Structures are given as structure tokens and as C-alpha cells.
């Protein structure tokens, strides 16, 4: 009924050597970086159940596993669920919208794995498991101005912006910063990196955190353009389309639609097509108090509303008295802390922290009890 998941760990060079072990007791005796723990049915690394591919168990029976609304809307598990362990800051990224991902995939086809690997859009939610430092969206024009003034002599475009703090200038400035070359770029970093020494607090400290991993990158300027946030454990943010963001430090749950598309906007050595980037970015400020997702608590369930149909995400507080958890779709249940006893009829499945279970549509509901919390990814249709 309930299938305990065997999950892939991506050992990207940027991953923590200790965070998955320290939190969840996941073994790592050769000390590889452990960057992402994948829960789902990705074609390149499907989670498995007891052994067989979860992705294969789904395609063998879509209706029973996904439920009819999901199988008729998506035709597969419509999300991928990760624990992300960033021991280094990652690249700034923008997800183009649906329309433009279609255009992009199609246009590239006339080279391959390319930024449009895939004609799908890529909504994302991140959920902090440990203090999680990030960038999300442009700051308010007035705060952009205040933060740039200590470095205004850095580059002509900054001066141009400060003189007229509008969306065009921000856009020009964004583009101008990424297209700095040679000594144009050095005059710029020097104004910035020398001026890290006579400024205090944030966002300067964040810049200083990034400069360890990216000394020679124009994205060192981004924390002046973009809202820096430290998510506390249990807070979350949705990453909209056309909105620069980056995951800089810490451990989180990440849910995403199935798209591998991404336009990089800095903190990266790879080539960046700035025209392509700039056409797919929304140069509107976004206030600090709209960044986090406001959850809704009902009973023991804390739901985080997602403005997109592709997935939904809820936290469930376990009590020693059983509670019912059900959905009209497939769900993945992931133990965040404590310990969860799952029961369906005669079946009992214990989840320790970091362990997950796949619950097919035809196996809802299940009874959960124990201590701590369980995260669930599912679909509300
Ligand atoms: Zn993203």
C-alpha cells in the first residue's frame, strides 16, 4: 500500500559533505559532496520501491498511482521533490514562462544538451529545513538606490540608474553588469570589493559570503539588486517566472514541476545570453513582505498554497493519536523531524527523519502518528 522510497543522491561538487549525514544519518564514508536527494520519478534517476523503478510502477498503472485527475491532466507524476544541501552559493537563475519556454525549446532545435532542454515551465517552492539564505526578486527601486550609492562610481550604468531609478535603467543595468568585460569589470569589482571594507551588515555580508566562491563574478552585485532573505526553518517561498533568484546557503526542501530549463543570470562561469535573459525577466520590484508564502493551518495540516496546479505542499504535525492523511492523487510523505508511524490497515511503515514513502492514489488515505512533522507533496485537483 505504502512504499518506502529508495532515493538518489546527486553528488554535485557544490553539495555538503555532512549535512545529509548530520540531519538524517545518511551514510557517506568517502565524503562525497551530497547536493540533492531526489524523491520522485525523474527519467534519469527515479526513486525506487521494493526492487523496481517508481517511474516504471507509475507508467505500468497511471490511474491507480496518480489518480484520474493527475493522470488526465499531466500523464505522469507532475513534480520532483528534493532535499537540497547547498554548502556553496549556486547560480542566479530565471525561469522563463510557459509561452517563452515553448518558443525557446523550439528555437534551439533548429545544438542540444542549451537552456531550453525542455518546453515546460518550471514553478518552484523552497522550504527551509535549516537557516536558508537566498535571493528572490528585485528589491524596491528606493532600496536599490540606497545600496548602489556606496558603489555608484563602479560603473556608468549604475550612475545612469541612480539618476533616474526606473525599470528601463534597472534592465539596462542588469544587462550592463553581466556584460562587463576586462577592466570595465575590474574597475567595477574594485569599487565593490574595496568597498565591502567600509560598509556593514546586509546585503554586504552576503556579497562577502559569495565572493569566497565567486571572486571574479558580476553577480557579486546582485544582492544590491535582489532581495536577500534568510528563511528560518519552516518558512517557505515560491519562485515565480521571470524572477531572478539564487540559493546561497543552507538546507531546504524544494518542490518543482518537471522542467530542466534555466537561464543563468550570474554566479556561474557558463556563457549567459543576456538578450535572452533580459527578454525573460520582469523588472518590477517585489516588497520584502510578499516573498514568503503564507500557509494556512487546518487541524494538524499546514498547507502552503501554490498558485500553480502542478503540485501542492503541506506539513503534518504528528501526534501519538493517529490522524488521517489523504489526497485525491499520488503523494510523497517525507519525515522532517521526530518519527512517523504510517498505517494502512494491517501495514505499518516507520519513517525516520529524511525517509520518504510513496502513497499511490488508490491507497489514500493513510493514518499517521508519532512525533515531529511530515512534509507532503501531492496535487489538489
Ligand atoms: Zn529555481
Curated annotation (Swiss-Prot):
Gene3D superfamilies: Jelly Rolls, Phosphomannose Isomerase, domain 2
Main location, first listed in the record: cytoplasm
Transmembrane stretches, start-end: none
Pfam families, sorted: MPI_cupin_dom, PMI_typeI_cat, PMI_typeI_hel
Main enzyme class: isomerase
EC annotation from Swiss-Prot or TrEMBL: 5.3.1.8
Gene Ontology MF, one: mannose-6-phosphate isomerase activity
A GO biological-process term: GDP-mannose biosynthetic process
SUPFAM superfamilies: RmlC-like cupins
Recorded family membership: Belongs to the mannose-6-phosphate isomerase type 1 family.
Official protein name in the record: Mannose-6-phosphate isomerase
Annotated keywords: Cytoplasm, Isomerase, Metal-binding, Zinc
GO CC annotation: cytosol
Amino acid at each position: 500500500s505504502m512504499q518506502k522510497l529508495i532515493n538518489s543522491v546527486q553528488n554535485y561538487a557544490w553539495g555538503s559533505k555532512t549535512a545529509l549525514t548530520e540531519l538524517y544519518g545518511i551514510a557517506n564514508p568517502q565524503q562525497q559532496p551530497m547536493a540533492e536527494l531526489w524523491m520522485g520519478a525523474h527519467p534519469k534517476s527515479s526513486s525506487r520501491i521494493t526492487t523496481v523503478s517508481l517511474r516504471d510502477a507509475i507508467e505500468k498503472n497511471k490511474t491507480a498511482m496518480l489518480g484520474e485527475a493527475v493522470a488526465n491532466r499531466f500523464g505522469e507524476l507532475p513534480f520532483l521533490f528534493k532535499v537540497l544541501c547547498a554548502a556553496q552559493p549556486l547560480s542566479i537563475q530565471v525561469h522563463p514562462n510557459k509561452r517563452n519556454s515553448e518558443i525557446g525549446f523550439a528555437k534551439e532545435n533548429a545544438p542540444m544538451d542549451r537552456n531550453y532542454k525542455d518546453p515546460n515551465h518550471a514553478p518552484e517552492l523552497v522550504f527551509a529545513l535549516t537557516p536558508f539564505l537566498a535571493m528572490n526578486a528585485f528589491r524596491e527601486f528606493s532600496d536599490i538606490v540606497s545600496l548602489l550609492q556606496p558603489v555608484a562610481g563602479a560603473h556608468s550604468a549604475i550612475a545612469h540608474f541612480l539618476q533616474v531609478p526606473n525599470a528601463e535603467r534597472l534592465s539596462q543595468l542588469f544587462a550592463s553588469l553581466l556584460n562587463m568585460q576586462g577592466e570595465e569589470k575590474s574597475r567595477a569589482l574594485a569599487v565593490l570589493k574595496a568597498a565591502l571594507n567600509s560598509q556593514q551588515g546586509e546585503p554586504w555580508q552576503t556579497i562577502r559570503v559569495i565572493s569566497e566562491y565567486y571572486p571574479d563574478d558580476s553577480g557579486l552585485f546582485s544582492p544590491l539588486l535582489l532581495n536577500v532573505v534568510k528563511l528560518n526553518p519552516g518558512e517557505a517561498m515560491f519562485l515565480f517566472a521571470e524572477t531572478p533568484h539564487a540559493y546561497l546557503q543552507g538546507v531546504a526542501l524544494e518542490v518543482m514541476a518537471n522542467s530542466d530549463n534555466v537561464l543563468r543570470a550570474g554566479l556561474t562561469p557558463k556563457y549567459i545570453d543576456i538578450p535572452e535573459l533580459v527578454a525573460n525577466v520582469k523588472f518590477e520590484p517585489k516588497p520584502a513582505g510578499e516573498l514568503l508564502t503564507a500557509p494556512v493551518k487546518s487541524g494538524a495540516e499546514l498547507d502552503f498554497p501554490i498558485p500553480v496546479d502542478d503540485f501542492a505542499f503541506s506539513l503534518h504535525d504528528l501526534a501519538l493519536q493517529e490522524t488521517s492523511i489523504g489526497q485525491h492523487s499520488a503523494a510523497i510523505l517525507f519525515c522532517v523531524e521526530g518519527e512517523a508511524v504510517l498505517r494502512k490497515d494491517e501495514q505499518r511503515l516507520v519513517l525516520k527523519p529524511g525517509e520518504s514513502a510513496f502513497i499511490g492514489a488508490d491507497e489514500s488515505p493513510v493514518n499517521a502518528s508519532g512525533t515531529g512533522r511530515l512534509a507532503r507533496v501531492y496535487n489538489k485537483l
